[PDB]
Structure formats: structure tokens, C-alpha cells
Design a protein around this ligand. Sequence first.
Ligand code: HEM
Ligand code: HEM
Ligand code: HEM
Ligand SMILES: [Fe+2]
Ligand SMILES: [Fe+2]
Ligand SMILES: [Fe+2]
Ligand SMILES: [Fe+2]
Ligand SMILES: [Fe+2]
Ligand SMILES: [Fe+2]
Ligand SMILES: [Fe+2]
Ligand SMILES: [Fe+2]
Ligand SMILES: [Fe+2]
Ligand SMILES: [Fe+2]
Ligand SMILES: [Fe+2]
Ligand SMILES: [Fe+2]
Ligand SMILES: [Fe+2]
Ligand SMILES: [Fe+2]
Ligand SMILES: [Fe+2]
Ligand SMILES: [Fe+2]
Ligand SMILES: [Fe+2]
Ligand SMILES: [Fe+2]
Ligand SMILES: [Fe+2]
Ligand SMILES: [Fe+2]
Ligand SMILES: [Fe+2]
Ligand SMILES: [Fe+2]
Ligand SMILES: [Fe+2]
Ligand SMILES: [Fe+2]
Ligand SMILES: [Fe+2]
Ligand SMILES: [Fe+2]
Ligand SMILES: [Fe+2]
Ligand SMILES: [Fe+2]
Ligand SMILES: [Fe+2]
Ligand SMILES: [Fe+2]
Ligand SMILES: [K+]
Lengths: 155, 155, 154, 155, 155, 154, 155
Amino acid sequence: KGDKKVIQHLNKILGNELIAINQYFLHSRMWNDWGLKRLGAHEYHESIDEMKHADKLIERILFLEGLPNLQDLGKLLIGENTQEMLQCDLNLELKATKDLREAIVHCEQVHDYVSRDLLKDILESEEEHIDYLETQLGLIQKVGLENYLQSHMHE
Amino acid sequence: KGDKKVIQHLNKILGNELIAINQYFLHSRMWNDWGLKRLGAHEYHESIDEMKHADKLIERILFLEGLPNLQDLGKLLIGENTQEMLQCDLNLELKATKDLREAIVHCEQVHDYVSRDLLKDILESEEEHIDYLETQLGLIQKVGLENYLQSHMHE
Amino acid sequence: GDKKVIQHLNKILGNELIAINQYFLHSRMWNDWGLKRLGAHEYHESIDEMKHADKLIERILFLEGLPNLQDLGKLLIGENTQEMLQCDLNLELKATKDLREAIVHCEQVHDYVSRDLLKDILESEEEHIDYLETQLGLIQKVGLENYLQSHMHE
Amino acid sequence: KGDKKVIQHLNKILGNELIAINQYFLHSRMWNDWGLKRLGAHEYHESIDEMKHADKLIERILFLEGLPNLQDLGKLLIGENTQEMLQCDLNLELKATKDLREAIVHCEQVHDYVSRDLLKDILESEEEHIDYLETQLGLIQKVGLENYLQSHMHE
Amino acid sequence: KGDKKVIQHLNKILGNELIAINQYFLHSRMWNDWGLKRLGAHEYHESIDEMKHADKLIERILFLEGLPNLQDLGKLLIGENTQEMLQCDLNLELKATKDLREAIVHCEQVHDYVSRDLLKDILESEEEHIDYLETQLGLIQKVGLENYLQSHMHE
Amino acid sequence: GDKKVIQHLNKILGNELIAINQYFLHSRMWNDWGLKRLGAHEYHESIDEMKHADKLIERILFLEGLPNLQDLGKLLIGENTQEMLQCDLNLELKATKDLREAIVHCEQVHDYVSRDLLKDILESEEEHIDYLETQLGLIQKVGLENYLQSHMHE
Amino acid sequence: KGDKKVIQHLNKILGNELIAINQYFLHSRMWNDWGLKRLGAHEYHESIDEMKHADKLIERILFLEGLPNLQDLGKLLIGENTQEMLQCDLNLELKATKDLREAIVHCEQVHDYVSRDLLKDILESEEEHIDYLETQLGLIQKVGLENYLQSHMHE
Ligand code: HEM
Ligand code: HEM
Ligand code: HEM
Ligand SMILES: [Fe+2]
Ligand SMILES: [Fe+2]
Ligand SMILES: [Fe+2]
Ligand SMILES: [Fe+2]
Ligand SMILES: [Fe+2]
Ligand SMILES: [Fe+2]
Ligand SMILES: [Fe+2]
Ligand SMILES: [Fe+2]
Ligand SMILES: [Fe+2]
Ligand SMILES: [Fe+2]
Ligand SMILES: [Fe+2]
Ligand SMILES: [Fe+2]
Ligand SMILES: [Fe+2]
Ligand SMILES: [Fe+2]
Ligand SMILES: [Fe+2]
Ligand SMILES: [Fe+2]
Ligand SMILES: [Fe+2]
Ligand SMILES: [Fe+2]
Ligand SMILES: [Fe+2]
Ligand SMILES: [Fe+2]
Ligand SMILES: [Fe+2]
Ligand SMILES: [Fe+2]
Ligand SMILES: [Fe+2]
Ligand SMILES: [Fe+2]
Ligand SMILES: [Fe+2]
Ligand SMILES: [Fe+2]
Ligand SMILES: [Fe+2]
Ligand SMILES: [Fe+2]
Ligand SMILES: [Fe+2]
Ligand SMILES: [Fe+2]
Ligand SMILES: [K+]
């Protein structure tokens, strides 16, 4: 039996994963639909990463005797072109990261160091997502948008 | 976009790494030159470890949007014989480790748990290095210097 | 070892030290920017100079000198790809100039084994210079954006 | 032995092979030098094709008890940028093809059907070179000079 | 950008390579045509050697920002029988080797050590060519002409 | 072939021939004492010099001179391992000095291929010198008995 | 402690091995230099065999507590053409064989049966050398000098 405020945080984090999963899945398919297959494939793997984050959160919530909340789906940020799509993912990650850090503070406070550890490993992974996303946005500026999309057409 | 003092702490640690890379590479080659090829190889391994520490710090700094400092090289503690060389390496590692604990404190205070994780990984490895060095100096007292060196002539 | 040979060899060593750190930082800068093929090529240049330094350090010790790894000259760090290449080029041209003077001096005291070491390093520095001048040249011919594009993925 | 006029024709064709060898090898090496390595390698291949054409003409001429002329080297057409280099190669090929068709007419007239066959193989291969070259000058127009060159940087 | 006088020397060494390629290639095929195929294969290999020296010289000239001269072809020294053919190659190598020594001296004088090194490699191979050729001429004296040729009929 | 270059090559060859016998005797002296690792290493030095000799012999003949395997100068034979190592070191320092002078002469008459050969030999002699000095330094640092002990078994 | 006179016999045999090693090495390289490579390969094998005999004599002498003499080198018999070379080698082997028989008597006389055995093996090998050398001299008479040298040009 875990602490109630930590379980609530785990659920908040899980809520954030549920959004990211659907948002990235849809963006991946949007990119695939437009023949930008490489963007589509990379986004798809981002989506699978969030699905695994979720899975670990769900196991942890149950082990601590909480109820995993898969019912509440927050606001998807869907873009209409590849540059908005990248910025929408990036805004979602920055929000996920704020929430991860407050959850980690809470775990530390009540000595739930195993939850803390799970949260730190997700955070490292969201920081990599941010890195990738900011880099793509930078590349579009350095190589020009048309060139960037050309380079992400074929796998 | 990370904290200014965290970046500065990472640059400090990076500075300690750069020192260790040069001191250890030089010690390693001095040992090879003397035909103490086992001590040379091991010291070469330590040098490569510190090169890999530097790499990871540089990448973290760049990602947090700081400027990695590879320009400032502190004082190399260069020994004149194997007992001095080991003790000089031990002195540098004890100093790197003190700096690493202070950097970790700050990362925790400002919620940069990914930087902290990197620093902890680096601290764990510096503590192995200290173990290696204290062990050697102890072996010199237990088996005698001439035996110690003889046992480290041939790889 | 002629004391002046050792001094030339420590001077080359000091150039190697600057190139190592300059190229390693430039490599990581390009990786950070997502230009991984430039990043990887530059990392490979950094490694070559680490190897030159190693051989310089072995030869100096053999001739009974003290390798200087304490003094680190000025890094030329660029802030965009063209400037980073030009910095790399400017460092190589300086390095190549010292190597030549060191080779003259080795010949004059008959340290022919030091001459051969340094001529091997020089050959590798001319290769580096060729790579650098070629990338500049290619930026002019294909355009900066296309050049960067073709160095994004490995 | 061979008809004297046929041997002269075979030598004129060899003469054209020797220009092309040298012109194509210099251009290959110019392209490599500029880091256009895909162009370089393809032009090197074209050079080698012509070395093999020379080799067969030399063998045939000696078999017909004629004297192969490798002393007279005509005018190399060297360009100073890639569009000029391709146009120079194409001008040379159109010249070579015209000489080939006239050597073949003459072989037919004097019943030297084996030399005709060798000449026809060479002609088929020059026709492939012409196609390669016209196609490249065409792609320059369709994809733009810069994009064309970009796509022939790396092998 | 290399030394004007160095580039002019490299072009003179190139001129010598271009003469040797054609001369040895013709000699090779004359020997093949006569059924002396071992002599023919060996001379072909010498030909290939020279082509490879040419390629090296061309790359270096282009790297020193010079203009390689494949336009001028000096005088082929062509023999009528195996003894004259070997002697003509030998005459040509000795001239080549004299030019090599002069160019090396010049590279040394202006500190182009990488060009000197290229030219020394070529020189070592030309001295191997001279050794080969002198040895054959000696063997023709020791074993008699007819025996020499008989031993070079089949590969 | 230039006559003074040929006489310089024959002089290098005379040094190689001394080195071969001295090193081979030293090797078998060490094997006979049961210091087999020293013996094996000395044997490998001996073979190196046999290969140096072979190479000089071919060059001398190509240049149309007469190789001299008739004159065999003074072997430096030690009586214990320190002294045997020091004799070899004194022979290498002599050899190296003659090498430098021959190389000077080859350069002055433009025999660059002979110079290349001599410079490869020299590089190898300087490696032999580094092995030798290094073993002598190791006797001082680990003790003569320890050093011998670590060179008993292969 | 070996018998002083056996050790002096052993050193005389070793003296002969050292002359043979140098004489055959040089004749081998003279054959290679002349392009007579099969003669040269075989002579080289002979020189190697004498190097092995010298090796075994050295070990024996040192085991018997004697001083091996590698300082004194007797007269090389060097020839100027292939017939002289072989006859020179033959004169050196007959001289070696006479000294070997005398050492074997001495060994037997003082009961050093292991030395006699080492020398017996050496003798059998010198007799094989003699067979090879007289056989080649015979062959020159039967097939002619020029045919003989022709058959020994290529390996
Ligand atoms: C005196 C300065 C240095 C010397 C002498 C030196 C020498 C070397 C050598 C010999 C190697 C292995 C080369 C090989 O693959 O054969 C190496 C590897 C490496 N170095 Fe350095 N180095 C120096 C400085 C640095 C610095 C400043 C960095 C900065 C991060 C660095 C990062 C690396 C990395 C990432 C590797 C590859 C390690 C691996 O094997 O995974 N080195 N260094
Ligand atoms: C008469 C003029 C020439 C003739 C007849 C000729 C003939 C040949 C032939 C038959 C080959 C082998 C082709 C194969 O792969 O089957 C060859 C290869 C080659 N040629 Fe030429 N060649 C000539 C001139 C040149 C010139 C002027 C160059 C200047 C660089 C050159 C450079 C080369 C090179 C680099 C190769 C590849 C050799 C190797 O790597 O094995 N050739 N040549
Ligand atoms: C005391 C005089 C010498 C002794 C005792 C000696 C002994 C030996 C031995 C034991 C070997 C290894 C043979 C085997 O079993 O394969 C060898 C190889 C060889 N020797 Fe000598 N040798 C002597 C002098 C010479 C001389 C004067 C030369 C002239 C160059 C020479 C040239 C060679 C060469 C080229 C090899 C083959 C090395 C290799 O590539 O492995 N040796 N010698
Ligand atoms: Fe996630
Ligand atoms: Fe909380
Ligand atoms: Fe994420
Ligand atoms: Fe990408
Ligand atoms: Fe497509
Ligand atoms: Fe470290
Ligand atoms: Fe702090
Ligand atoms: Fe450390
Ligand atoms: Fe370098
Ligand atoms: Fe100087
Ligand atoms: Fe460089
Ligand atoms: Fe053709
Ligand atoms: Fe006609
Ligand atoms: Fe063609
Ligand atoms: Fe193409
Ligand atoms: Fe590239
Ligand atoms: Fe050549
Ligand atoms: Fe000149
Ligand atoms: Fe040649
Ligand atoms: Fe036949
Ligand atoms: Fe030697
Ligand atoms: Fe001299
Ligand atoms: Fe040596
Ligand atoms: Fe050892
Ligand atoms: Fe034992
Ligand atoms: Fe023998
Ligand atoms: Fe007797
Ligand atoms: Fe024998
Ligand atoms: Fe035979
Ligand atoms: Fe042959
Ligand atoms: K493009």
C-alpha cells in the first residue's frame, strides 16, 4: 500500500502518457499518409516508448494498491503541418517533464525511492524526446523546410 | 534550457576530467617507457574512462544550452616514480569526488534529476578508481615495491 | 636527444592537444545540431590527433625529454558549420607550418627517425586539410543548405 | 594481312580512344578532388571502358600486321566545371561515333567482317556513353545544378 | 596551393609516366601477338604500375592546385625484337629516374615533404623496374636468346 | 652505384654481421642458464639483424658492388646478464652512428632508395636500443634477481 | 665438463659451419640477383641448414661448459659464375666432412657418444649436400650449361 499522494502523482503521469501515445500515433500516421515515411517511423517509435512508460506506471500503481486511471484522456495537441506537429509534441513533453519533476519531489519526501527511480528513468527518456524534437526544429531552420521533408520521405 | 549554476558545476567537473585525461595518459606512457607495461595499460584504461566522462558531460552541457569549456586546463600532478604517480592520481580523484558531491547537491536542489544521474554514474566510477589506487599503494606496502613493480612488468 | 628536437616535438604535441579538444567540441556541436555525419567525421579527426599525440609523447620520452601536456593553446571554436570548418582549416595550416620547421631541424641534426614520424603526421595533416578545403568548396558548389542536408544522416 | 585502309581506320579509332582515356581520367580526378565522388567514380569507369577499347584495337591491328599508333595524341577537351566537363565528353563521343560509322562502312566494303564486329561492339558501348552523358545534362535541367551535384557528392 | 616549380616537376614526372604506359602497353601486346605470353603479361603489369604512378601524380597536382598535363606525349621508344624492346624500356627508365632525383631535390629544398615521399615511392618502384630489365638482359646472355624466349612462351 | 655509398653499405653490413653472432651467442648463453624468455627475445633480435643483412646484400648487388661477408669485427660478449645487455647496447650505439653517416652520404649523392633502406634499418635499431635501455632501467627498479626471475619461463 | 679436446673439435666444426653459412648466403643472393631464382632458393635452403647445425653445436658446446667461438671466420670461397660457385661449395663440403670424421673418432675415443651422435647427424646432412652439388655439376655436363641455367631461372 503506497502513499495516496504518490499514487495520485503516478496517475497524473500516466494521464500524460495516454495523451502522448494517441497524439504521436496520429501524427505518425499523418506523416505516413503524406509519404513522409521516416518522420512517420520515428514518431511511431516515440508512441511505442510512451506506451511502455504507461505500462510501467500501471504496474507500479497496482502494486502499490492504487487504481490506474485509463479513463481520463486529456487534450491532444494535433498540428496540421510538420512544423506545428513537432512544436505540439515538444509542448506536450515540456508539460510532462514539469509534472515528472513534482512527482519525484513527492516520492523523495515520503521515501518511496523505487517509484522515484521509475520516474527518473521516464524523465531521462522524455528529455531524449525533447532533444530529438528541438533538434528537428533546428534542422528545419538550418537546411530549410523543403530539404528537411525531402530527407524524411524515404526510410 | 537548464540552470546556470548547474551548467557551471558541469563545466567544473568537465575541467577535472580534462586534467585527469592528460595526467593519466602521461603517467601511462611513462610506465610503458619504463617497461612497466601492466601499470601502463591499466592507467591507459583509466584515461579512456575519463575521456568518456568528458564526452558525456560535453553532450549534457550542449543539450542544456551551455558552452562547454575545453579551454581551461588546471594543474597536472605529475609524479617522478610509481608510488608518487599513484598518490598524485589518488589526490586528483579525491578532489574530483568532492566537486562531484557538491554538483549533485545543486542538481537535486533545482530538480535536474537527469544531470544528477549522470554525475552519480560518474562518481561511482571515480570511487572505483580510488579503490584501485588505494589498493595498489597498499599492495606496495604488503609485497614490497620491487615485487609490486616486477608483477606489473609484463601484461 | 637534441634538446631543440625535443622542443620541436613538444611544440607539435601542443598543436595536437589544441586540435584534439577543438575537433572534439566541434564534433559534439554538430551532433547536438543533428548534423551527425559532420559530427562523426569530426570525431574521427579528433581521434587521429589523439593518435598523433600518443606517438609524439612516446618519442619524446624515448629521447629522454619531458612531454608537455600542461600548456593548452587557444581553441578556435566556430559558431556555425562554415566557420567551424574554417577554424579547423586555420589550425591545420598552422600545424603544418610547425611540422615543416621541425622536420628541417631533425634533418640538420640527423634525427631521421623523428623526421619520419613527423612526415607521417604531416601526410595525415595534408589529408585533413584536403578534406576541409573540399567541404568549403562543396558548400560553394551545392549551397549551404543542401550541404548541411547531405550531412544530417549517417 | 589487313587492307591498309582498314588498318588506318583502326588507328584513327585508337587515336580517339587515347584522347578519351586521358580526358575522362583527368575529369574523374577533377571531380574526386572537388569531393564529387559519385561523378568521379562513374567517369573513372568510362575511362577504363576506353582503355579496354584501345586494348582490343591494338590486338586487332597487330593481328592484321599493322603498326598501332600510340604516339599521336590529339586534342583533349577539358572543362572547368561539371556542365562543361559533361558537354566536352559528349562532343568527343559524337566525334568518335562518326569515325566509327565510317570505319564500319569500310570494313563491310572490303569484307573484313571481324573488324566490323569489333567496331560495332565499340559503337554500342559509345552509344551507351552518349546516353549516360545526355541524361546527366538533362537531369541538371530538371533537378537544378546544385541538387544534381549534391546527389553525386557521396558514393 | 603548392610551389610552381614543384608542380612543374610533378608534371614532368607525369609526362614520363604517360610515355611509359603506352610504350609498355604496346610492347606487352607485341609480345602477346608473337606468342611470348610470359613476357607479355609481365610488361602489361609494368604498364599498370605506371598507370598507378600517373594517378598518384595527378591527384597530388590537383591537390596542390596545379593543372595536370595529360596533353603532351613525348617520344615512345619502340623496339623490333625482344632485346631492343627491353633495352628501350631500360633507356626510358633511366631517364625517368634522373628526372625523379631532380624533383626530389626540389621538394626537399622548398619543404614539400609529402611530394618528396610520393616521388621516393615512385622512384623505388622504378628501380625495381630497372632491376627486372637488367636481369632479363643478363639472362639472355647467360642462357642464350632462344632459351630465354622459350622460357617466356607459356605463363 | 656510387662507390662511397657501396662502401658505406658494406660497413653497415659488417655491423649487422657482428650483431648476428653476438646476439645469437647471447641468446644461447641465456637458454643454457635457463633464462629462456631472455634467450627467446635475444634470438628474435638476432633474426632481425639477419634480415637487415639480407636486405643490404641485395642492394649492394643491385648497385653492382661486392658484398663483404668476409670481415667480421669484434664481438662484445658479456659474462652476466647486465653486462650482455650493455654490450648489445654499445654495439647498437655504434651501429646507429654509422647509419647516420651513411644516410648523410646517400642524401648528398641522391641515392634516395638506399637512404630509405638505411632509415628503416635505423628505425629498427632505435627500437632495439629502447628495448635494451628499458631492460637495464628495469634491473635498477625491480632488482636483478626479480628481473631474472621474470625472464626464466616463456 | 666436456673433454677439452672434444670441445676444440666442436669449435672447429662450428668454425666450418660459419664459413658455409656466409658463403651459401652470398651465392644464393648472387643467383637471385642474376635472375636465377631456383638456384638461389636452393642455395638459401643450404645456408639455413648450416645455420641449424651451428645452432646445435653452440648448444652442445655450452652444455659441455665450453666457450663457443663465433669470432673466427675462415676464408670464404666465392665464385664468379654458376659452375665455380657450385665447385667452391663442393670444395668447402669435402673439407667439412674430413674435419667431421676426425671429431667423431675423438668423441668415440673418450666415450662422448652424444657428441658423436650430433656430429654423425651433421655428417649425413653434409653428405646430402655433396650429393646435390656433384649432381648439379654432372647435370651441367649432360644438359649443357645454358639448358641448366634456363631450368633454374624460375621457381
Ligand atoms: C592528451 C589528450 C588525449 C590523448 C593523448 C588521447 C588519446 C586517446 C587514444 C589513443 C584513444 C584511442 C584511440 C584509438 O581508437 O586507437 C582515445 C580515445 C578516445 N578519446 Fe582520447 N585522448 C586525449 C584527449 C581526449 C579528450 C580531451 C577527449 C574529450 C572527450 C577524448 C575522448 C575520447 C573518446 C570518446 C575516445 C574513444 C573511447 C572509446 O574507445 O570508446 N580524448 N584517446
Ligand atoms: C594506352 C593508354 C592506356 C591503355 C591502353 C590502358 C589500359 C588499361 C587496361 C587494359 C586496364 C585494365 C582494365 C581492367 O580492369 O580490365 C587498365 C587499368 C587502369 N588504368 Fe589504364 N590504360 C591506359 C592509360 C592509362 C592512363 C593514361 C591512366 C592515367 C591514370 C590509366 C589509369 C589506369 C588505372 C588507375 C587502372 C586500374 C589499375 C588497377 O588498379 O588494377 N591508364 N588500363
Ligand atoms: C652464427 C651465424 C648464424 C646463425 C647461428 C643463424 C641461425 C639461424 C636460425 C636458427 C634461423 C632460423 C632457421 C629456421 O629454422 O627456420 C635463421 C634464419 C635466417 N637467417 Fe640465420 N643464422 C646465422 C647467420 C646468418 C647470416 C650471416 C645471415 C645472412 C643474412 C642469415 C640470414 C638468415 C635469414 C634471412 C633467416 C630467415 C629469417 C626469417 O625470415 O625467418 N643468418 N638463422
Ligand atoms: Fe512518456
Ligand atoms: Fe506532490
Ligand atoms: Fe516523451
Ligand atoms: Fe532524421
Ligand atoms: Fe519515393
Ligand atoms: Fe572522471
Ligand atoms: Fe552549487
Ligand atoms: Fe577518475
Ligand atoms: Fe595531428
Ligand atoms: Fe629549429
Ligand atoms: Fe590534423
Ligand atoms: Fe571507346
Ligand atoms: Fe574508308
Ligand atoms: Fe566512349
Ligand atoms: Fe547518378
Ligand atoms: Fe560528406
Ligand atoms: Fe612510373
Ligand atoms: Fe628544380
Ligand atoms: Fe617504371
Ligand atoms: Fe604453346
Ligand atoms: Fe641491424
Ligand atoms: Fe661518407
Ligand atoms: Fe639492432
Ligand atoms: Fe620482459
Ligand atoms: Fe622452471
Ligand atoms: Fe653444416
Ligand atoms: Fe682429435
Ligand atoms: Fe653442408
Ligand atoms: Fe633443379
Ligand atoms: Fe621470367
Ligand atoms: K536537395
